[PDB]
Ligand binder design. Structure first.
Ligand SMILES: Cc1ncc(COP(=O)(O)O)c(CN)c1O
Ligand SMILES: Nc1ccccc1C(=O)C[C@H](N)C(=O)O
Ligand SMILES: Nc1ccccc1C(=O)C[C@H](N)C(=O)O
Lengths: 410, 410
């Protein structure tokens, strides 16, 4: 094994080849949706399948229809003209966009700043490229007495200021957040922008959940803020946008002197992405782009159809004494697990408290979920190990199955 | 730009983008098939698309059905059991497979041996991993007298020997060869094998064209010689097997302890590959695994087809005075052009001869092709710059248009 991958062989999700295998259990664990995709999405794949060229190679950096379209949608969003060939790069999912960014822009010895809990791949990527990850936790604030929400989490500008030294290359930001479903505010985002201009650092912005915003909140992109355009890579995904997680396409949007670097990583790695997938995706995009103002547009329709599902979950968890944190965005929900009962000597491993709960709730309650501690640096886990993550981009069928379990908990 | 990607930004395939952007030219350059893929392969992708599940995440190291299919197929060819899960890794084409291997096994300062001409991604992949490529030319011997063939290109055993030192981490083998089209013999692979076991080094073997061997020749697989299972990673590709280059799926077969390192890379880069494509390929592989013994199996009829088309091409090139090397395998043909004294004098660049020739041939003759010096390191260009590579994975109609071009050449 090569030095650069030393001690990167434990992956957290490989490890969840633990009980989810069961049949008789409802799985609210992985971000694996079971709603049907928008039927036209499935259409276009078929249609793409039958055209010979759409089965042979395409522009290495993105199928020309697909990039033209990304161009169109996103420059509506940025209020700017976005070059399809120079400011976009299509990669194998958001994962492969994250990886093109880190490998392309970050050396041995740099520090990359990461907010905990983090989507878990941010750490090993940054460690694969020889950098030192630097951690800052999100912290609770007094709620409004009434309920618990993602907005009651936030970060201390003076702590953040202090992680920036002359060794910081980049800060990874992910909004809407996974796992808490925080939507960063214009003010929170402005602190991060201030610091990157001041230290001249990159921001890499994981926005795969961008359309998933609920009432009372707005996805805002840091790349839009004064002075960010030319120091930011913003990442999207087809998986999130069209409930087609199995296609594994996303895109980095950004200025040319940064994008060309990611293009270099790509041509030296995977080069080209699948054509039938990108042909079909472009079409799926155009269909929705021509109806943005309309409640049919998958952009407007899916968060509206997801908010109800979010609420069913808050209830199902209040109903059994799990304290839910209600998410501004994305399709996850964390619940505080700690003011429930039980027993957890059965185990007497001292792997974290939530892993123990999750196994207990799998065996005893026929329900799985993800321990929030998986997404936490070692240092940080004690402070999040009573938190457990649940996923709700599920079909009614499945949320009934779930509601039975809950109904029947006590 | 990160140091790991210093001067890895130029890429030949980029450079060649402006060549036949012209609608009225007949492109025999890119390895872009324009025959039809098998009907079944297109149908299965359609089928796939209308099933919900196979538009979501599947197993990271490969779709269970696909790897089951590959373990079956390749167990047949290696005459041994291949582990579905530990002995196979599915990745974005053979590029990504190559990239997994070098990323996972090759450290900075290590030497990797590469035979010239080489597939051009080899060099840059190995430099990015901080490794030093150590180059050695394929040299010609005399012709039988009637025919110039790939088989008249070989390497010098003692020259090769002297390339392995206590710093050789690996050798890269490409058979069938791109661009010569050479099918290595049991003897030639016996010499490379002898050396790897003497120096305790690895062998990465690019064998995507495994099925395209023509009469009189046989794909032999180095990984099957004594001593080499332990130490070889053998790659293979969906674009080449099913003429579906736009799918960009490949595999690397090899031992569990070498193989695990390739998955540490993948899980930390892009992770999954697309589901519907693997779903569909799985199924195509079943249709042809269960008929291996027939003329109608795609593994059989595709070479049978192209043997015809190749032979058509030896003839056209001989027509206009071009000296073809008739390939044992693959679907490229290399022709010598020096005996034309083309009227380049007055492109005045510092380009090698063959870039100038292809430029000239494009403007004047209306036909593109690829210079072989694109498959050569600096020191080797001059011993290869009179050669030019043409592709014949084309349909009749296309070969026709090429036929007119040659017939009006003088
Ligand atoms: C924050 C975040 N970033 C990136 C990804 C990458 O997913 P994909 O590569 O399949 O687009 C995910 C997985 N859901 C995610 O939740
Ligand atoms: N983590 C993975 C590893 C391999 C294959 C898929 C996934 C996922 O889908 C993660 C999911 N989006 C999650 O955050 O729960
Ligand atoms: N080289 C590429 C770069 C980008 C996109 C496709 C290709 C190819 O298809 C290569 C072709 N098979 C070749 O060897 O000529």
């Amino acid at each position: 094994n090569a030095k650069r991958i030393e001690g990167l062989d434990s992956n957290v999700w490989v490890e969840f080849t633990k009980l989810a295998a069961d049949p008789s259990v409802v799985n609210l664990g992985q971000g694996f949706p079971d709603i049907s995709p928008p039927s036209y999405v499935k259409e276009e794949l078929s249609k793409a399948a039958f055209i010979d060229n759409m089965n042979q190679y395409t522009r290495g950096f993105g199928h020309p229809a697909l990039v033209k379209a990304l161009s169109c949608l996103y420059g509506k969003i940025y209020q700017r003209q976005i070059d399809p060939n120079e400011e976009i790069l299509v990669a194998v999912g958001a994962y492969g966009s994250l990886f093109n960014s880190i490998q392309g822009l970050v050396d041995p010895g740099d520090e990359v700043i990461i907010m905990v809990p983090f989507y878990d791949c941010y750490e090993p990527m940054v460690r694969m490229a020889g950098a030192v990850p630097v951690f800052i936790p999100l912290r609770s604030k007094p709620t409004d007495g009434m309920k618990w929400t993602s907005s009651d989490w936030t970060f201390d500008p003076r702590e953040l200021e202090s992680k920036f030294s002359s060794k910081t290359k980049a800060i990874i930001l992910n909004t809407p957040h996974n796992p808490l479903g925080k939507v960063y505010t214009r003010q929170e985002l402005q602190v991060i922008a201030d610091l990157c201009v001041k230290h001249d650092t990159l921001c890499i912005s994981d926005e795969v959940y961008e359309w998933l915003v609920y009432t009372g909140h707005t996805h805002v992109k840091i790349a839009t803020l004064p002075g960010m355009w030319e120091r930011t890579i913003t990442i999207g995904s087809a998986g999130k946008t069209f409930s087609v997680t199995g296609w594994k396409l996303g895109w980095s949007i950004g200025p040319a002197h940064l994008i060309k670097h990611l293009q270099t990583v790509q041509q030296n790695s995977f080069y080209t992405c699948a054509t039938p997938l990108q042909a079909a995706l472009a079409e799926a995009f155009w269909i929705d782009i021509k109806r943005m103002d309309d409640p049919e547009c998958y952009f407007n329709s899916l968060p509206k159809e997801l908010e109800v599902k979010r609420d069913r979950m808050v209830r199902l968890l209040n109903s059994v004494g799990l304290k839910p944190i209600v998410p501004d965005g994305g399709y996850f929900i964390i619940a505080d697990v700690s003011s429930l009962g039980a027993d957890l000597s059965d185990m007497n491993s001292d792997e974290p408290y939530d892993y123990k709960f999750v196994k207990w709730m799998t065996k005893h309650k026929k329900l799985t979920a993800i321990p929030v501690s998986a997404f936490c640096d070692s240092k940080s886990k004690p402070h999040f190990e009573k938190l457990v993550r649940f996923c709700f981009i599920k079909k009614d069928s499945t949320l009934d199955a779930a509601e039975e379990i809950f109904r029947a908990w006590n």
